[PDB]
Amino acid sequence: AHKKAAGSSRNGRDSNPKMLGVKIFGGQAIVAGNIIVRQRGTEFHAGAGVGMGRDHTLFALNDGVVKFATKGKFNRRYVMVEEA
Amino acid sequence: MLQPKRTKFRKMHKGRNTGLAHRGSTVAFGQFGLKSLTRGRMTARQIEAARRTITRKIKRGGKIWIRVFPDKPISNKPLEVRMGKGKGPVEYWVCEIKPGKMLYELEGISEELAREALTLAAAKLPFKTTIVKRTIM
Amino acid sequence: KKAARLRRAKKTRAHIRFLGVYRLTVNRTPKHIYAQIISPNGGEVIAQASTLDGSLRSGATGNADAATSVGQLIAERAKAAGITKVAFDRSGFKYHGRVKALAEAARENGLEF
Amino acid sequence: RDKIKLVSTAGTGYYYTTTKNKRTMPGKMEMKKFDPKIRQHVLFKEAKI
Amino acid sequence: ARLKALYNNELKQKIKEELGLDNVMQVPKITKITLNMGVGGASQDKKLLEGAVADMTAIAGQKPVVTKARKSIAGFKIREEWPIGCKVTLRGEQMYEFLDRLIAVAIPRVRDFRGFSPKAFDGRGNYSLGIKEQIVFPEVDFDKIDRIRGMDVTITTSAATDDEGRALLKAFGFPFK
Amino acid sequence: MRKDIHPDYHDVLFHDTNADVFFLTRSTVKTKTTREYEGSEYPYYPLDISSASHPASFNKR
RNA sequence: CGAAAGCUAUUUAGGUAGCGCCUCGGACGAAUACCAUUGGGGGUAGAGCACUGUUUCGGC
RNA sequence: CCUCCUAAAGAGUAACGGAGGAGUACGAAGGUGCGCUCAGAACGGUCGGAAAUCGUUCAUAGAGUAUAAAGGCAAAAGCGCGCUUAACUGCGAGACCCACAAGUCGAGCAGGUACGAAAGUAGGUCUUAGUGAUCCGGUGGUUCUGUAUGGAAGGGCCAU
RNA sequence: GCUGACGACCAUAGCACGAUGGCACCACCUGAUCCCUUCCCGAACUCAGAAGUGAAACAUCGUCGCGCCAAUGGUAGUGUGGUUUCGACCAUGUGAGAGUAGGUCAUCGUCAGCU
């Protein structure tokens, strides 16, 4: 085993997947309660027609069509539900 | 033997060496460069041998710039060890060289004794090289 | 400082915009007090009342009594414009004194909030 | 944190269950909780779980 | 507040003419006087802090607020939110009365007094001085005293330049040099 | 000013007896004798010093 | 007609089970695929030093 | 079990691949109403310094966030104060994820409540770890059953 | 023509520098009785007011010093089909980032007030 360099640095752990991301995209029909984004923190913010869960999940508060925008002075990404 | 003073991480993924040196393909500080026409890994030992052989030939009347720094750790597995059971330990450091990169620059010396030192250095390097002038565009 | 006052008004402003109701914004200065009703979209003024109105321009403005008159007058203007249910927006001013007097006058003279 | 029982003082036998640190809260806790057996908020006192 | 009356009567105008200010509202004025009694020996005896609070109450005429540590420092053995000082802010007539007392009755009672250096301005027209022995103030009495302690007096003025600040302080008869 | 939290703070008549110059001001000091002024009588505090008073050799032998 | 050598779990690892994939029957009937135009979100290839680090030379 | 990367810009994706955390804490560190803004650097100032507390001037966060990392955070989610128990009961349209068993988010409705002048907000905590099926046995409730009948024992249902 | 409120938008809107503004409005400003404030403080908040000033702030105007925006061309990468010396190359579709020329001292809406 010459040089004995078989040094154990043991780290083989990992967590289970969380399946975050955008669930419904822009221009799709949506019904109230439908989850739009799963995320950690507010990568997307809730605009009109969408609510925000304790997990930062974004969901449709009412029926319509999903719309993505960048609005406000923080240049934040917003998800809205337009009545259409 | 160049080496980073300290690193964020001990070990690195192999990666790929692809593409041309669009950055670092210009004689920037000196008047005379040795640039690589081929790609590969430049070991810190190779950099040290080439620097020694340029310094001896220019004899403290000229200035050298080493444009390559070995910041990629290369792990190695010792002999008589099976596959697996964790990534090997770091044994040496390389710089990734693309075709076109300047490795050495010289300034403050005659063209002839700069070309001699650069040819001497090229002899110790794992690259096909060429000697380049400083243009302005 | 107006900057600090607008910093501390934005929470209520955004919550009212989420609620999507007509909002009764107040704005008082050491000289005058203003009250205007904004549409749920937030960019239309549909009723207003200030101490710059000729009825109470040449009088004791900048006063709790003037605030009471302004609230009483904007309640009538809102009633005549069809508004009955608003959300009050103290606009970072403390709910007290002149702002409170305006709100109590508007709340007692027809507007319910 | 030890598990404790918060029991209704209405005598309905209803209880909530919770945990507490018996070193930063050595006295028995008591809170006004909703009792579904009488549909009212009443005092619930800590008991042994 | 004889100093308030006198400043609004004649000091303001003469400062304006002496500084050559165009606008009457450009004249410097004193906005606040802060008394600080930072006792770093607190949180290890818990007697010095109350003594300093009593002495500050006697001096300023206001109830002082006990200032607590904003950080932990191992060298000073200080932890988060430990009471390590006292401060009182004086404004209006209270500040003007304190200034009159400090100018007329307190500063002359400083042992070996040669004047306060004029380069002790911060550069924004704010002055600061340090009183080594608090018994300079007649309010605190030498007989029933706990121990000798000092104090910081910061005069925060409306001035924007060091020259304006020093002119304002000279207007009140402050002992410079 | 919050009530009943601040100390006693009343009139006082400091008097530099050296230069014989008075100083009427508010202070918390409790004096012993109440000397009268032009208006009325306030607690009187005598002062030793105040702002009105406080400021080769070969040939000799 | 026509797979699979996958996922999940397992005293499991060359066994077994649910799901996936095969077949047969029924229901349903374009809800499917391809392409054109079009509405989205992204942080990869490339790139770059604005952050975290790392590197060289000069000035200071 | 959680976080990052490998992971090829939707999700997922292996290795005895590279790195780190968890098996808790909190009746306030939860709810609400109101209020506030950090780290640093320089200048001035008693002890007092590189750095204590005080004052000033710049300072979009170079801080903080109970704790690892990532993502987020000014309407602050960061920091205070008053009152409090929504860390509620019955549920839940609709989705996410998913072999199953599980897991996750959730407007709205009813009843009771807290805070707010109010519109309101509140079914724990910035979120993502802090976990263990069934069987068996214990405990608090309950009329459901009760081996001739009335009981009871035992069983069931709800909570633990 | 200007001021204020609330928005759209979120740097071509910002920063900096200079200039103009007090009849309205706004801001400083005066006082702290009263309501209400301060773990101290009328600083902030709050009230009652107009002796004073546009000094600060704010608003407006000007400019390119910074910032920000930004081509065209080229290059890199890349889907599909082919080839390869494994670097790449060809056909076709696509096409950055950086940099350069250049641009920018915003543009709109509702309501009220003075002229």
UniProtKB/TrEMBL annotation, chain A:
GO BP of this protein: translation
A GO CC term attached to the entry: cytosolic large ribosomal subunit
Keyword terms, alphabetized: Ribonucleoprotein, Ribosomal protein
Stretch list, region Disordered: 1-19
Listed name of the protein: Large ribosomal subunit protein bL27
NCBIfam families, per the entry: L27
InterPro entries from the UniProt entry: Ribosomal_bL27, Ribosomal_bL27_CS
Gene of this entry: rpmA
Family (UniProt): Belongs to the bacterial ribosomal protein bL27 family.
Alphabetized HAMAP family for the sequence: Ribosomal_bL27
GO molecular function term, any single one: structural constituent of ribosome
Coiled-coil positions: none
Automatic annotation (TrEMBL), chain B:
Keyword Coiled coil among record annotations: no
InterPro entries: Ribosomal_uL16, Ribosomal_uL16_bact-type, Ribosomal_uL16_CS, Ribosomal_uL16_dom, Ribosomal_uL16_sf
Family matches, as SUPFAM superfamilies: Ribosomal protein L16p/L10e
KW Nucleotide-binding (keyword) present: no
GO process annotations (BP): translation
A molecular function (GO) term: structural constituent of ribosome
Subunit organization: Part of the 50S ribosomal subunit.
Protein name, UniProt field: Large ribosomal subunit protein uL16
Organism: Psychrobacter urativorans
TrEMBL record, chain C:
GO cellular component, one term: cytosolic large ribosomal subunit
Annotated organism of origin: Psychrobacter urativorans
Summary of the function given for this chain in its UniProt record: This is one of the proteins that bind and probably mediate the attachment of the 5S RNA into the large ribosomal subunit, where it forms part of the central protuberance.
One MF annotation (Gene Ontology) recorded for this entry: structural constituent of ribosome
InterPro entries to which the protein is assigned, alphabetical: Ribosomal_L18 (IPR057268), Ribosomal_uL18_bac-type (IPR004389), Ribosomal_uL18_bac/plant/anim (IPR005484)
Top-rank taxon: Bacteria
SUBUNIT field: Part of the 50S ribosomal subunit; part of the 5S rRNA/L5/L18/L25 subcomplex. Contacts the 5S and 23S rRNAs.
Keywords assigned by UniProt, alphabetized: Ribonucleoprotein, Ribosomal protein, RNA-binding, rRNA-binding
Keyword Ribosomal protein tagged: yes
HAMAP family attached to this UniProt entry: Ribosomal_uL18_B
GO BP terms, alphabetized: translation
Similarity annotation: Belongs to the universal ribosomal protein uL18 family.
PANTHER family assigned to the protein according to its UniProt record, in alphabetical order: 39S RIBOSOMAL PROTEIN L18, MITOCHONDRIAL, LARGE RIBOSOMAL SUBUNIT PROTEIN UL18M
Protein name: Large ribosomal subunit protein uL18
Automatic annotation (TrEMBL), chain D:
InterPro entries linked: Ribosomal_bL33, Ribosomal_bL33_CS, Ribosomal_bL33_sf, Ribosomal_zn-bd
A GO molecular-function annotation: structural constituent of ribosome
Protein name as it appears in the record: Large ribosomal subunit protein bL33
SUPFAM superfamilies referenced in this protein's UniProt entry, alphabetically: Zn-binding ribosomal proteins (SSF57829)
Alphabetized NCBIfam families for the sequence: PRK00595.1, rpmG_bact
Alphabetical keyword list: Ribonucleoprotein, Ribosomal protein
One Pfam match: Ribosomal_L33
Organism annotation: Psychrobacter urativorans
Membership in a protein family: Belongs to the bacterial ribosomal protein bL33 family.
GO biological process: translation
Cellular compartments per GO CC: cytosolic large ribosomal subunit
